[PDB]
DNA sequence: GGTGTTGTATTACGGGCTC
DNA sequence: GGTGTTGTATTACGGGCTC
DNA sequence: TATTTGTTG
DNA sequence: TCGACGAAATATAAAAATTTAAAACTAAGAGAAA
DNA sequence: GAGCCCGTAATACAACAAAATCCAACAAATA
DNA sequence: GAGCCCGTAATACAACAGATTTTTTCTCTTAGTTTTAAATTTTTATATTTCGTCGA
């Protein structure tokens, strides 16, 4: 029956989703929301030809994102070769297809509470995570973190909290789970060093952090001036149809492009055999197929 | 089985597969009788689809939802679509094992009584017994039984509507007049019918267990199944050798059965009532 | 004229001891 | 969790008589 | 004379 | 060993233009089991 | 003990145990 | 009574009662179809990531 064929597909989807969730460690209601999103995807003429892990990964990610959590796409793509950015591209394609509404926010405060236990742990687990989220809350309102890989800003905030506090830990060991390049990491660290006066860095940062304006994102510095220094009127908006009409498409207009192009459109025939020598030398079996 | 609870909480389910067909709209009779009151019902099916829950819902939900269903492993009730409905709704399922229809019981005994009643009402009137089926169930309902001694109307709210004559120990006998005091009456009926069910249980146990030898293993044995509920019920029994291999038991699912690790694809069930085991014993 | 009938675990009854 | 169960002729046991 | 159709291990 | 830059990978919106899965969807085929 | 009437009232005993096709083969019935 | 051992020996209890195909849904398994979306190119300005290299 028509209803009979749905059940086997849903059972396969449930089996694969539970198989991934057994390694992702996600709660039950997240998996339930992911399965209902998979049902919605099948109701939207589910994308055929895609790999099975891509669509289930997209549904799992959107379910884990609809409630504020900590899971990252690398964790979805952590089986020895997965090419995470293809999963991200499939998710981006399914954003428009599934028509996601009530989009969730992107705030890295919940990231720190999960990154704390693996790298740079604390005896009470109250000091370093609260310090990192407290500095991140005011560094967010300075319009510096905008579309800049929330895992990276979370790791940078954790490193800043470790720097201002006392914690004997290896600097380079954080890349095991953060997976952030050192170049952008040190860029964000010395960006924080530049934007802060470092008045009481050795003891504890300033307890009244207010930066109203006064700062710009680095990309604004790069390309606002569009160079290097080291409500208009409708009449002011011309139509481009006249630009297309300027060039004549007449059949007899075959000699309007005489700017020495007529002598050099193609290769000369005297060197055709010279080309053909190395052509049959190399580009010979490339055509027989 | 454990005797009962409050009225209409345990329900027995089975049906006879085939009858001489009527005009081509009805084929076979399904029965619902509760374990407590043994109230007859007229579920006339077509030998069915996944719409079993429709007709079944329309005929038990007239009273209300039960707690457990005592039935067989039939495909209309093994029925993964229908079982999940019971798990969601809050209905258990005893699901008597392969070719062991004894557990269904009250419905089997009712269709025993129904078969005689259906023969009585359709001896000269075959092919239109669906008209007489409500008369069959109403007659079964109005006639007192033996193990309870009262009519199944009286085991329920006692409102035998026919009242040809007043019964013994003449009283008001008009439960319509009673409006709020029905709680004490139903409590009294429940108490006496519960002790009558216990009396029926102990009487059955006395007159049956005079030779029934028990078998209590519950773990770690190598029991057999002598070619019944192991092979198909539709598989023919003949003078072919009975050489079922030595199986194993891993769980004590009940006092009177043990689940087995059936060395097949799945066998679709692994519950074997003790009437097929005949425990294997090795020797060094 | 012609109409049940044995195999099988299971269990009941005497010699010999304690009385 | 989940695992027999009543309809039916047939027959056995108390009040009341003979003792 | 072949194709039926009652009943019975 | 912190700073300084180069550079592919994505989106992007189209027109396109040959091969590659690829997973829903049918449809036998066995196996249950009253 | 000994039996009898009569009136209830227990009491093992078996039926529900899916349903209905023929298989092989006697002999009746036409046409 | 009261039980026990053991050695024979009766003792009710059940199987032989034509056997097989169907009938109606269901539920894994396993091979064939269908719609559809995707592997390598131009390309264009934008930005961030991650290598990759170089320098004093």
Swiss-Prot record, chain A:
GO CC annotation: nucleoplasm; nucleus; transcription factor TFIIIB complex; transcription preinitiation complex
Main location: nucleus
Sequence repeat boundaries on the chain: 20-96, 115-194
Keyword Phosphoprotein (UniProt): yes
Gene Ontology terms for molecular function: DNA binding; RNA polymerase III core binding; RNA polymerase III general transcription initiation factor activity; RNA polymerase III type 3 promoter sequence-specific DNA binding; TBP-class protein binding; TFIIIC-class transcription factor complex binding; zinc ion binding
Tagged with keyword Transcription: yes
Keywords: Activator, Metal-binding, Nucleus, Phosphoprotein, Repeat, Transcription, Transcription regulation, Zinc, Zinc-finger
GO biological process: DNA-templated transcription initiation; DNA-templated transcription open complex formation; regulation of transcription by RNA polymerase III; RNA polymerase III preinitiation complex assembly; transcription by RNA polymerase III
Subcellular localization(s) per the UniProt record: Nucleus
Coiled coil: none
Top-rank lineage group of the source organism: Eukaryota
Further details from the record: Present with 4330 molecules/cell in log phase SD medium.
Subunit field text: TFIIIB comprises the TATA-binding protein (TBP), the B-related factor (BRF) and the B' component (TFC5).
Function: General activator of RNA polymerase III transcription. Interacts with TBP. Binds to Pol III subunit C34 and to the TAU135 component of TFIIIC.
Family: Belongs to the TFIIB family.
Identification of the protein by name: Transcription factor IIIB 70 kDa subunit
Species in which this protein is naturally found: Saccharomyces cerevisiae (strain ATCC 204508 / S288c)
The organism's taxonomic lineage, starting at the top: Eukaryota, Fungi, Dikarya, Ascomycota, Saccharomycotina
Gene giving rise to this polypeptide: BRF1
Stretch of the intact protein here: 71 to 497 of 596
From Swiss-Prot, chain B:
Organism whose genome encodes this protein: Saccharomyces cerevisiae (strain ATCC 204508 / S288c)
Lineage, uppermost ranks: Eukaryota, Fungi, Dikarya, Ascomycota, Saccharomycotina
Positions of the Integrase catalytic domain: 1-160
Protein name: Integrase p58
Binding positions for Mg(2+) 3 per the UniProt entry: 14, 72
């Amino acid at each position: 029956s028509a209803l009979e064929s749905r059940e086997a597909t849903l059972n396969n989807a449930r089996r694969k989703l539970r198989a991934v969730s057994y390694a992702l460690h996600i709660p039950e209601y997240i998996t339930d929301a992911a399965f209902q999103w998979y049902k919605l995807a099948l109701a939207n003429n589910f994308v055929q030809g895609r790999r099975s892990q891509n669509v289930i990964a997209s549904c799992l990610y959107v379910a884990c994102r609809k409630e504020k959590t900590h899971h990252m796409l690398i964790d979805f793509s952590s089986r020895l070769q997965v090419s995470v950015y293809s999963i991200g591209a499939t998710f981006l394609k399914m954003v428009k297809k599934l028509h996601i509404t009530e989009l969730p926010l992107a705030d890295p405060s919940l990231f720190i509470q999960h990154f704390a236990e693996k790298l740079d742990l604390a005896d009470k687990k109250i000091k370093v995570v609260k310090d990192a989220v407290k500095l991140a809350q005011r560094m967010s309102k300075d319009w510096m973190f905008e579309g800049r890989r929330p895992a990276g800003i979370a790791g940078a905030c954790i490193l800043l909290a470790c720097r201002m506090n006392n914690l004997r830990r290896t600097h380079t060991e954080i890349v095991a789970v953060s997976h952030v390049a050192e170049e952008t990491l040190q860029q964000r660290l010395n960006e924080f060093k530049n934007t802060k006066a470092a008045k009481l860095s050795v003891q504890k940062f300033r307890e009244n952090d207010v930066e109203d304006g006064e700062a710009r994102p680095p990309s604004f510095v790069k390309n606002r001036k569009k160079e290097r220094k080291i409500p208009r009127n409708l009449h002011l908006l011309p139509t481009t149809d006249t630009y297309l009409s300027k060039v004549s498409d007449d059949p007899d207009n075959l000699e309007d492009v005489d700017d020495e192009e007529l002598n050099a459109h193609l290769l000369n025939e005297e060197a055709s055999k010279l080309k053909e020598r190395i052509w049959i030398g190399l580009n010979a079996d490339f055509l027989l197929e | 089985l454990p005797i009962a609870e409050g009225r209409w909480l345990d329900i027995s389910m089975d049906f006879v597969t085939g009858l001489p067909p009527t005009s081509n709209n009805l084929n076979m009779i399904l029965v619902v009788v509760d374990r407590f009151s043994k109230r007859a019902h007229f579920i006339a099916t077509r030998k069915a689809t996944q719409l079993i829950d429709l007709l079944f819902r329309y005929i038990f939900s007239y009273h209300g939802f039960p707690r457990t269903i005592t039935s067989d492993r039939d495909v209309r009730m093994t029925a993964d679509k229908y079982q999940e409905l019971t798990k969601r709704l809050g209905i258990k399922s005893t699901m008597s094992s392969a070719n062991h229809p004894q557990t269904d019981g009250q419905s089997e005994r009712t269709i025993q009584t129904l078969n005689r009643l259906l023969r009585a009402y359709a001896s000269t009137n075959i092919q239109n017994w669906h008209v007489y089926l409500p008369q069959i169930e109403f007659v079964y309902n109005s006639t007192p039984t033996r193990t309870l001694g009262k009519s199944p109307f009286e085991i329920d709210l006692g409102y035998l509507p026919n009242t040809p004559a007043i019964k013994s120990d003449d009283e008001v006998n008009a439960r319509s007049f009673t409006a709020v005091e029905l709680a004490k009456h139903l409590k009294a009926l429940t108490i006496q019918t519960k002790e009558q069910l216990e009396h029926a249980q102990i009487e059955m146990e006395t007159n049956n267990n005079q030779r029934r030898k028990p078998l209590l293993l519950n773990i770690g044995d190598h029991v057999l199944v002598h070619r019944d509920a192991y092979f198909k019920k539709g598989a023919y029994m003949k003078v072919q050798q009975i050489y079922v291999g030595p199986f194993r038991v891993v769980k004590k699912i009940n006092d009177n059965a043990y689940e087995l690790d059936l060395n097949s694809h799945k066998k679709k069930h692994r519950v074997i009532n003790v009437q097929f085991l005949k425990k294997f014993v090795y020797r060094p």
